Amino acid sequence: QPFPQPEQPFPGS
Amino acid sequence: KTTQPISMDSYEGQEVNITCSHNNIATNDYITWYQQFPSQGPRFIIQGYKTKVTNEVASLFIPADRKSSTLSLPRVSLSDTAVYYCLVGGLARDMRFGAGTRLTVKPNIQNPDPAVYQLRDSKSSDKSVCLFTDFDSQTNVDVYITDKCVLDMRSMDFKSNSAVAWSNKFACANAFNNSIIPEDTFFP
Amino acid sequence: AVISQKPSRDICQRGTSLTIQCQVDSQVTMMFWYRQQPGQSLTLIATANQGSEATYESGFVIDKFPISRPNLTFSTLTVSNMSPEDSSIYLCSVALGSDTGELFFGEGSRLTVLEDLKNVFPPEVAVFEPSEAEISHTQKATLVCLATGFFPDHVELSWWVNGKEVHSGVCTDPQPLKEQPALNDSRYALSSRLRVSATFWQNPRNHFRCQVQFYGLSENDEWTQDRAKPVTQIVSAEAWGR
Amino acid sequence: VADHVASYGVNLYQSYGPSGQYTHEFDGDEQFYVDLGRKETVWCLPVLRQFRFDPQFALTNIAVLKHNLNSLIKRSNSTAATNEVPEVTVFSKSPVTLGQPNILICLVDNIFPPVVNITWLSNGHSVTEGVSETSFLSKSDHSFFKISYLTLLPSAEEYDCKVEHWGLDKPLLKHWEP
Amino acid sequence: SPEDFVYQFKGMCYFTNGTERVRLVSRSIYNREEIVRFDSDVGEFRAVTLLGLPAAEYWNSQKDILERKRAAVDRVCRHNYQLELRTTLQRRVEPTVTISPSNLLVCSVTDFYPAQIKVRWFRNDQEETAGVVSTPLIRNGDWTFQILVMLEMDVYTCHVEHPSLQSPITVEWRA
Lengths: 13, 188, 242, 178, 175
Ligand SMILES: *[C@@H]1O[C@H](CO)[C@@H](O)[C@H](O)[C@H]1NC(C)=O
Ligand SMILES: [Ca+2]
Ligand SMILES: [Ca+2]
What we know:
The structure holds five protein chains of five kinds.
Chain A: no helix or strand
Chain B: E1 7-11, E2 16-21, E3 30-36, E4 42-48, E5 53-54, E6 59-61, E7 68-73, E8 82-89, E9 101-106, E10 115-121, E11 128-133, E12 144-145, E13 149-153, E14 158-166
Chain E: E1 6-16, E2 21-30, E3 33-39, E4 45-47, H1 53-61, H2 63-70, H3 72-84, E5 97-101, E6 104-112, E7 118-123, E8 132-134, E9 138-139, E10 145-152, E11 155-161, E12 169-174
The complex binds 2-acetamido-2-deoxy-beta-D-glucopyranose (NAG) and calcium ion (2 copies).
GO molecular function (chain D): MHC class II protein complex binding; MHC class II receptor activity; peptide antigen binding
Protein name (chain D): HLA class II histocompatibility antigen, DQ alpha 1 chain
GO cellular component, one term (chain D): lumenal side of endoplasmic reticulum membrane
C-alpha cells in the first residue's frame, strides 16, 4: 500500500 | 483485474471505441493498453492515469470515477486488425494480460460483383482451384475451404475479398454451396 | 527497447532441453518471460531477477523452467524434459524502470515439441494460373498459390515478380488449415493470392513465382528413413504470362 | 524547509561485500526495513504493521544500484569513499533509578562509509543478551547514524559501548555508569 | 581500511501545511556526492555533477519515465501521506517529567512524540531567563524523543508544554 520510488538504471556498463 | 469485450467488428474508416471495465481500481493504479498483431508480441500504444490522454495511434478517455476506461481508434484501417489488451496496475509487476478484444476491420467495397472462377495448375492440367472473389464484406464463408482474406492494390486504391477452395476430386458451382453465396453471382 | 531472441524457431524431440536467450540493447530494470500456446492467452511464466532466484508464477516450477540473468541486459530460459504441451511461442518482455507503463516485447521463439520426428514433411507448392473469365469481366488476373502436405505450422509465403518481392495486391491466409482434421498428426495447407492487371498477366515475359519458406529439422536431429530428410528448405512454384 | 519530511525509499548499496539496505523513513525515524536475505518486511512501528510492502521491490531496486555503482566506478576512475570519524554518545532512555528498568542508548553519528561494529561491554566481558540495533538512518549530508540498545535494570556495580569504524585508529569505547 | 564504494538513492517527500505544499525530490548519490536529482518544482532530471549528466540526459530522453516521475508527486508523496494521517501522524505520547538534583536542578522530559516542546523553569512564579542550559533534542530512535533542561541554583517548578498535553505539566521541587 505504501507506494515506493524506484531508481532508474544508468546507461552502458 | 480487468474485464473487456471478447471481440468486436468494424469497417474501415470508422471510429472504434473499446471500453475497459476496471472496477476495484486503486488510486495509484495506472491504465495501459497494448496491441498484439498475430504471431508477434504485444506493442504498447497509449498510457493514461485519472487523465484522458491523446496520442498519435490513438486517444484514451478516463472517466473521473476511474471505474472504467475507453480506448478510441480514429479512422481504423485494415492494418489495425489485432488483439487489444487492457492492463491496470501500479508497477511493472502488476501488469497481467487478459483475453483482450479481437478487432476485425472489414473493407468498404463500393462496387461489389460476386463471382466464382476456376483456376488450373501451371504444372499439370489435372488439378484445379475455385476462386470466390469480389464479394462484399458482410458475407461470410475431402473438400477444403479457406477463410476470407482481403487484398489491397494500392496503385488503384482497389480492395477486394476472396476465398479459395480445392478438392482432389468437384465443381466450382457447388464449391461454396455451404456459404450464403449471394444470388448476384457470376459463373463461367 | 530492442530485444533479440536467439531461438526465432526450432523443432525438438521429447525429452530434450532447449535454452532460449533474451538480449536487450539498453539497460533495463525488469525482464519477464511469457508463453503463448497456439490458441490461448499470453501466460506469464516468471520474472527474471538479477543475482537472485526467479519469481515463478503459480504452476511454473524452477525444475522445468530454470531461469538465469547474469546481467540486467541478458536472460536465459530453459525448458527441460520437453513434452508436446510445451509447444508454444516463448516471449520475453522488458521494462526500463519498475515505474514504467511500456513493456517492450521480443519477436518471440516458436517451439513445437514432437513425439515422433517422422511426421515432418516439407510443403508442396503449386501456383494456379488466372482464369480467362476473370480477365474477361474484371480485367484483372488473380494468381492463387497453394502449399500442402507440411506438418509443422512454420511456413512463410512470399510472392516474387520478375525476381523482386512484391507486397501490393497480395493476400495470404493468417492461419494454415489442417488437411485431415480430427487427427493429431494432421498435415497443414496454406493458400495465397496475387492479383495484377489484365495487360500485365497477358504479357509473356513477366515472371510470377510463389515462394514458400519452410522451417524443419535442425542439425541435431537424426534421420534414418529411406525418405529424404525434411531439412529447412525453400519450396517454390512459378508461372509465366500467356 | 517543510513541516514534515519522509524518505519513501532509502536505498543503499556499497562495494564492501555487496551490502544492501532498503528502508522507509518519516520525520527521521525508521518506519520499516526489508531484509534482503529473508525477503521479509520488518515494521518498526507497531501501528504500521497493518500495511503491506512487497519485499521483492527492494531486491530489484537494489539490483539497479548494483549496476549504477559499477558504472560510477568506471566513470570516476575508482574514486573510493572517505572514512569520516564517528561521534559516539551513550545515555539512558529514562531517568536512572537503580531498581526500575531502563534502556541504554549508544548513538553513533557521522557514520560514513556505512560499515560499523557496535558491541556493548560490561566489566571487560562482552554482553549479547538484550541488545538490538537500528538500521542505518540517513542524514542531510548523505552520511548515516546508527543506534544500539541494551535493556537493563540499573545497579551500583552495573557498561561500555565498543564502536569499530574505519575512521578510527583504535576501537572507541564510551563508558556509562549510574 | 579497505576501499569502499557507496551508492545511495533517496526518494524523499516534503510536506508543508499538511497536503497544501508537497515537494518531491529524488536524490541519486555516489559516495557522499549527489550526482543527479529530480525535483518536482523543476519537472525534469537535472545533473548536480558531471557524473550524473549521462543519466539525466538518458532519463529525460525516455518520455515514459518522465511522465511517470512527474506523477510520482501524487502517487508517492500525496498517496503515502494519507497513510501517515491514519498512523504516524496520530501517534501521541505524553511526556514524563521528573526533577532530580545533580547546585544543579535537572528536569528530565523522556518519552514524547511528536518533537514539539517548550520547557520553562520558574522560581516562585517568576520565569528564570538566564542561567538555564538545555540539552539538544535527543532522538531515541524508537519513535520517542527526550530532552534535559538543567538549571543551576523556595519552590522551583518545571513548566512543560506539548501538543499531546491539553494543559502544561508543572512538576515542582523544593529543599
Ligand atoms: C567488524 O568485525 C569484523 C570481524 O569481527 C571485521 O572483519 C570488520 O573489519 C569489522 N568492521 C570494522 C568497521 O572494523
Ligand atoms: Ca531442430
Ligand atoms: Ca502541578
